[PDB]
Amino acid sequence: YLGGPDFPTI
Amino acid sequence: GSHSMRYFFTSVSRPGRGEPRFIAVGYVDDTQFVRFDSDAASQRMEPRAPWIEQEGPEYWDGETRKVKAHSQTHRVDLGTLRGYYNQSEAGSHTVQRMYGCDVGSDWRFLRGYHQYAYDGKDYIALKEDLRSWTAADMAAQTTKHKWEAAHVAEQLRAYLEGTCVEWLRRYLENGKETLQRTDAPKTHMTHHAVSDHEATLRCWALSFYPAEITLTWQRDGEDQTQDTELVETRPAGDGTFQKWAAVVVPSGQEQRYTCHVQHEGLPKPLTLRWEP
Amino acid sequence: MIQRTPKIQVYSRHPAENGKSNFLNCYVSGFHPSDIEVDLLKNGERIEKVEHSDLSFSKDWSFYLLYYTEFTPTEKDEYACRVNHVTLSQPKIVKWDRDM
Amino acid sequence: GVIQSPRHEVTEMGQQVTLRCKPISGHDYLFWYRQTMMRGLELLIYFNNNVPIDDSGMPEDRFSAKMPNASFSTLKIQPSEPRDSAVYFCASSLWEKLAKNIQYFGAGTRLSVLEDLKNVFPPEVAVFEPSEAEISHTQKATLVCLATGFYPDHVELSWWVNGKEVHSGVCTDPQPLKEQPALNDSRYALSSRLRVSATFWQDPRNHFRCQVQFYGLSENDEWTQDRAKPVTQIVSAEAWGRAD
Amino acid sequence: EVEQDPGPLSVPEGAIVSLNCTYSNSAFQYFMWYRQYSRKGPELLMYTYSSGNKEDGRFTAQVDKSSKYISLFIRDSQPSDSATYLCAMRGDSSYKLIFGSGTRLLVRPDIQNPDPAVYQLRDSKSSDKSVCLFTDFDSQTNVSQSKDSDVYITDKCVLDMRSMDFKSNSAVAWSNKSDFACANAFNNSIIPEDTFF
């Protein structure tokens, strides 16, 4: 089960 | 005993192509259970183990939406990283992300991690506390500042310590027949010379799961490593693993040496010895 | 950009018996970057419809892959893995040793 | 902020409808929502870096959303139907605002898709006096404006005194009344009040105007009825003080 | 599915107000309350992760994830809290919000000294066309839509002076002059007393 909804950009 | 759920993300820039190649895979322990490839036709997160096929459509839409969203973020990362290091637009570069949680034999939370690499080198990583960051260089410091300002550690800690473990446990139950199995290594020894004074003894472990294993050569019962070669553990392709360990012995002396095999899948260690 | 050449293992899935269906594996690992070319070879000639696992990587970020195919080993047929990669001036051929 | 266009649209069914949104520059998430009156919002779609990420709320058939670049999204309905009438909102955001569930909203597009333009009428607008009685013991300035007979219900009412829009002393109804069988096909009515000191109404040099912006037909729309084309227009009524 | 009570709430200024929402999917982890003035976009008030209570000025939001029940309390309510309130929620796999249908809140302003008074009012252009203004009545009184004949009547709205601080309710009714006018206008409803004659 992935983390989300998303990750911040570098 | 202890268990893991880990996600691996790789994203490769292709100047002259429309988009980076994005690949994502998920593991529980040594067993792969999902994948996504940005170039594959499905444009879908795909099952790779029999037990997750049980999940309903909501699970699969969610997982595919999240991985697609991940690929977009990595796409912008590749462009901003390129600027940070002042690199040419002509070369292929790579971003890699790994995250997951460990759980003890009581299935409760041990450990969380979330690491990020650019061109095969540590870039930024969540420390053990899951509250702060380790940054490899100054490009990464700018990112750390941004991520600290955005409270990003907080989001990930909630996932690592809660949701990740909750799903890992759910997977362990639903895949118990294969995830909680253990396959004893099948073992044998092999014998080869050179001319006169030397020979090689090679001790094999085949078809074992999980992949952790210890192969030890003793002379006269003495744990001795001098001139001992362990090949990296290797997948068989059917879900099991293989490994061998060799010693080069003065010939005549072969009976003195003993191979020791340890594997949670077997109740006590094995001893093999060359017999001709 | 730092680079690591691949380690290569060629081997069968089950102990080889002549005339019996098996799977030939080429496991490449330790490499960076991830663009790699791997062929399985029979008597010098490349085998068609080889499959491979999904790209992953290790604690040190280096990549690994397994390539594999059904084959039926024989006394005389030589089998090999051929690997090309930016760090190699020439494709590296590692022949399958049954005893290994 | 987020800029949405058009603010109002009134059209016949069958037409293509295109709704537009410019997010706040720098934002890389864009959301399109729809709200039907006396109900809640519902997400149609959102985008991240111009790529649609979730479109589960998008209708199966006549709806289409795009984001050709970071500064612009469209939502298209072809062909439009009356049930598509709604307010359509656009919002934009960033990851760090989204972690606190913050989102920036456009002012919305109010869309009326009508079965027939023959039903469209602009308002008639009357102002009424202070009452004889009310003025002396209360000693404040009373007046009311009525906007009658309009359809659909896309109207912005405003009071002007001298050359200036005025808010103090103002209260117009939140919702328009219908002259109806409560049958959607009705025309509407709206009131507003304005008060200032009695000294104002009675005596001076007092420019006093109830103004109503109606949104109706554009120039694209064909019209052949004997009566004036009910185009988008401002209609007004006014009054001067001390006037039987 | 988010279930929310629609039904207009009308409370007096100063009152505590309670709004709430029920849901069905246990994967919702983020819960939000929005306020929306008539003809405008929604404004975030409060947001909760988990279960729990958050206070902020006059507002408290709470989340009971085992009852699947969430609430917002507004203390010491003000005229400017009048609006539709919407709850919204989501989980962790999408930024898609699921909204409840909304609850309409009217907070009736406190009126210092009523002077209920009903005035007849004639058309500026011409005459004969007329309309009745009932105004300066207290915010205990309630006003009734006519289902009787075709007489037209607007609910009360509140007029706000500023600088010089004065408020007053007002309402309006009319009908073409089939001579049943100002007295019969409130065979619908009326609380207190004054008039023209």
- The label of the residue with tokens 């409130």 reads E186
Judge contact between B103 and B171, C-beta under 8 A.
Answer: no
Instruction: Mark yes or no for CB contact A9/B73 under 8 Å.
Output: yes
Judge contact between B109 and B157, C-beta under 8 A.
Answer: no
What gap in Å lies between CA D207 and CA B134, rounded to an integer? 69
**Nearest-CA distance D64 → chain B (Å):** 19
Whether the link from the prior residue into D130 is cis, omega within 30° of 0, is no
Contacts of E182 (CB under 8 A, 6+ apart): E118, E120, E132, E195, E196
Instruction: Mark yes or no for CB contact B69/A6 under 8 Å.
Output: yes
CATH class name, domain C1-100: mainly beta
Chains D and B touch (3+ CB pairs under 8 A): yes
CATH class name, domain E1-109: mainly beta
Give the residue from B12, B145, B70, B125 showing the smallest Cα distance to C1.
B12
Instruction: Give the helix/strand (H/E) hosting B164.
Output: helix B164-174
| H helices present in D181-225, as ranges | 198-202
- Residue B266 DSSP symbol: S
Judge contact between C36 and C71, C-beta under 8 A.
Answer: no
Residues 96-135 (B) with a CB less than 8 A from some CB of C: 96, 98, 117, 119-122
Searching chain B, which residue's CA lies closest to the CA of residue D55?
B65
Give the three-class secondary structure for E32: strand
What gap in Å lies between CA B37 and CA E93, rounded to an integer? 19
Q: What is the maximum span of chain D, computed from C-alpha positions, in angstroms?
A: 67
CATH class name, domain E110-197: mainly beta
Residues 147-186 (D) with a CB less than 8 A from some CB of A: none
- Amino acid present at E156: K
Of D74, D94, D115, the one marking the end of a domain is D115
| Radius of gyration of chain C measured on its C-alpha atoms | 14
Q: What are phi and psi of D79, to 5 degrees?
A: -80, 155
Judge contact between B250 and B197, C-beta under 8 A.
Answer: yes
Residue E44's alpha-carbon distances to B267, D57, E12, E47, E62, in angstroms, are: 60, 21, 24, 8, 15
- Count how many domains chain D has: 2
Note whether D91 and D189 are same-domain residues.
Answer: no
Direct distance between the N- and C-terminal alpha carbons of chain A, in angstroms, rounded to an integer: 23
Of D94, D115, D136, the one marking the end of a domain is D115
What gap in Å lies between CA D102 and CA B150, rounded to an integer? 13
Among D27, D53, D95, most A C-beta atoms within 10 A, so best to mutate, is D95
Give the residue from B79, E192, D161 showing the smallest Cα distance to A9.
B79
Among B65, B68, B154, most E C-beta atoms within 10 A, so best to mutate, is B65
Chain centroid to CA E186: 22
Judge contact between D11 and D112, C-beta under 8 A.
Answer: yes
Residue E125's alpha-carbon distances to B161, D129, D238, E128, E194, in angstroms, are: 75, 10, 10, 10, 28
Contacts of E88 (CB under 8 A, 6+ apart): D40, D41, E2, E31, E32, E33, E34, E97, E98, E99, E100
Judge contact between C18 and C3, C-beta under 8 A.
Answer: no
CATH topology of domain B182-270: Immunoglobulin-like (2.60.40)
Q: What are phi and psi of D111, to 5 degrees?
A: -115, 120
| Domain boundaries of chain E, sorted by first residue | 1-109, 110-197
Whether the link from the prior residue into E192 is cis, omega within 30° of 0, is no
* Beta strands at C7-12 and C56-57: parallel, antiparallel or unpaired: unpaired
Q: How many CA atoms lie less than 13 Å away from E2 in the CB half-sphere? A: 27
Q: Which residues partner with E46 through β-bridges?
A: E33
Note whether D136 and D234 are same-domain residues.
Answer: yes
- Amino acid present at B276: P
Burial (CB count within 10 angstroms: exposed 0-12, middle 13-18, buried 19+), residue B54: exposed
Cα angle value E23/E29/E32 (rounded, 5°): 75
List residues in chain D that are followed by a break over 2.5 Å (C to N). none
Instruction: Mark yes or no for CB contact D96/B150 under 8 Å.
Output: yes
Instruction: Mark yes or no for CB contact A4/B66 under 8 Å.
Output: yes
Q: What are phi and psi of C29, to 5 degrees?
A: -160, 170
Chains D and C touch (3+ CB pairs under 8 A): no
What gap in Å lies between CA D2 and CA E124, rounded to an integer? 42
* Beta strands at B46-47 and E130-135: parallel, antiparallel or unpaired: unpaired
Note whether D7 and D81 are same-domain residues.
Answer: yes
Among E89, E90, E93, most A C-beta atoms within 10 A, so best to mutate, is E93
What gap in Å lies between CA B154 and CA B103, rounded to an integer? 20
Q: What is the CATH number of domain B1-181?
A: 3.30.500.10
Q: In chain B, what residues touch C57 (CB-CB under 8 Å)? A: 8, 10, 96, 98
Give the residue from A2, D111, E56, D97 showing the smallest Cα distance to B168.
A2
| Radius of gyration of chain B measured on its C-alpha atoms | 23
**Nearest-CA distance E93 → chain B (Å):** 6
Q: Which residues partner with D5 through β-bridges?
A: D20
Burial (CB count within 10 angstroms: exposed 0-12, middle 13-18, buried 19+), residue E48: buried
**Nearest-CA distance A4 → chain B (Å):** 6
CATH of residue D161's domain is 2.60.40.10
Burial (CB count within 10 angstroms: exposed 0-12, middle 13-18, buried 19+), residue C4: middle
Residues 157-176 (E) with a CB less than 8 A from some CB of D: 157-164, 166, 168, 170, 172, 174
Q: Is A9 on the interface with D (CB under 8 A)?
A: yes
* Beta strands at E59-64 and E69-74: parallel, antiparallel or unpaired: antiparallel
Domain that holds residue D69: 1-115
Residue among B7, B123, B150 minimizing CB distance to A2: B7
Residue among B117, B190, B206 minimizing CB distance to C61: B117
Q: In chain D, what residues touch A7 (CB-CB under 8 Å)? A: 95
Among E89, E92, E96, most A C-beta atoms within 10 A, so best to mutate, is E92
Contacts of B266 (CB under 8 A, 6+ apart): B184, B185
| Domain boundaries of chain B, sorted by first residue | 1-181, 182-270
Chain centroid to CA E69: 24
Give the three-class secondary structure for E182: coil
Residue E16, number of CB atoms within 10 A of its CB: 11
Note whether D124 and D213 are same-domain residues.
Answer: yes
Chains A and E touch (3+ CB pairs under 8 A): yes
Contacts of B214 (CB under 8 A, 6+ apart): B260, B261, B262, B263
- Amino acid present at E118: V
Q: Which residues partner with B125 through β-bridges?
A: B115, B134
Note whether D122 and D136 are same-domain residues.
Answer: yes
* DSSP state letters, B190-235: EEEE-STTEEEEEEEEEEEBSS--EEEEEETTEE--TTEEEPPPEE
Contacts of E99 (CB under 8 A, 6+ apart): D40, D41, D42, E2, E34, E86, E87, E88
What gap in Å lies between CA B5 and CA B164, rounded to an integer? 8
What's the token pair of residue B98?
A: 């790994």
Note whether D75 and D131 are same-domain residues.
Answer: no
Direct distance between the N- and C-terminal alpha carbons of chain D, in angstroms, rounded to an integer: 48
Judge contact between B42 and B61, C-beta under 8 A.
Answer: no
